[PDB]
Design a protein around this ligand. Structure first.
Ligand code: A1I4W
Length: 183
C-alpha cells in the first residue's frame, strides 16, 4: 500500500522487561529488567510499547513479522490510554488490537473479545488506520492480505499510537522478536 509509514519503537513507553534492537524496529521479551526513568509513559504491568509516531489524521499502513511466535498483540491505541496498572486490552479501553494467545487462538479486542476463524496462520500482519473514517483493519499478508478483522465506527478524537507486544514467554518458547517489515 502507498499509504505506508516507517515506524520507530518509542523506548520511553517500553515496559522495562522489553529489548529493542538499536534501530528500534525490533522488540523481544527479555529475561530481566532494565532500570530507566519509571516515567508517566512506560507500560508498567504488561510487555507493551508504542511507536514514536502520533497520527492526528490521514491513512497509514505498516506490516509486522510474527514468524516463530506463540503469542503477540498488534494495533493502534489512543495517546490517552492508561500506562500504569492492570487493565483489559479492549476498544472499551481505547485499544484497537488483535492477538495470538497461547498460540492456536487469534482474537480481536472487542468487549468481550471475539475469536477469529483463520485459514492460514500469519507470519506477517498488515495494520491499516483511516482516521477520518474511524477504521483500523488487520490483513493476513501470508494469505494474500485477506482481512483478519476490522473495527469501524471507532470515531477517534485524540492523537493515536501504533502498539505492539511480543507477548509473554510462559513456555520459554515465545522468545522470537516482533519485526517491522521494510515495505
Ligand atoms: C479477557 N481476559 C484477559 O485476561 C485478557 C485477554 C488477553 C490475553 C492476551 N492478549 C490480549 C488479551 N487480558 C488482558 O486484557 C490483559 C492484557 C494481557 C497481556 C498479555 C501479554 C501480551 C499483552 C497483553 C494480560 N491482561 C491481564 O492480565 C488482565 C488482568 N488480569 C486484569 C484486568 C482487569 C482487572 C484486573 C486484572 O488483573 C489483576 C491481577 O490479576 C492477576 C492474577 O494474579
Amino acid at each position: 500500500h502507498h499509504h505506508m509509514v516507517h515506524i520507530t519503537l518509542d523506548p520511553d513507553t517500553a515496559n522495562p522487561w522489553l529489548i529493542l534492537s538499536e534501530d528500534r524496529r525490533q522488540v523481544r521479551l527479555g529475561d530481566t529488567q532494565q532500570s530507566i526513568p519509571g516515567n508517566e509513559e512506560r507500560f508498567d504491568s504488561y510487555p507493551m510499547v508504542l511507536g514514536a509516531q502520533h497520527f492526528h489524521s490521514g491513512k497509514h499502513y505498516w506490516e509486522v513479522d510474527v514468524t516463530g511466535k506463540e503469542a503477540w498483540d498488534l494495533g493502534v491505541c489512543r495517546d490517552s490510554v492508561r500506562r500504569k496498572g492492570h487493565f483489559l486490552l479492549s476498544s472499551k479501553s481505547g485499544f484497537w488490537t488483535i492477538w495470538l494467545w497461547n498460540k492456536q487462538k487469534y482474537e480481536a479486542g472487542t468487549y468481550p473479545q471475539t475469536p477469529l476463524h483463520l485459514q492460514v496462520p500469519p507470519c506477517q500482519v498488515g495494520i491499516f488506520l483511516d482516521y477520518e473514517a474511524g477504521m483500523v483493519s488487520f490483513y493476513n499478508i501470508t494469505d494474500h492480505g485477506s482481512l483478519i478483522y476490522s473495527f469501524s465506527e471507532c470515531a477517534f478524537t485524540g492523537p493515536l499510537r501504533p502498539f505492539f507486544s511480543p507477548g509473554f514467554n510462559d513456555g520459554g518458547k515465545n522468545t522470537a522478536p516482533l519485526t517491522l517489515c521494510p515495505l
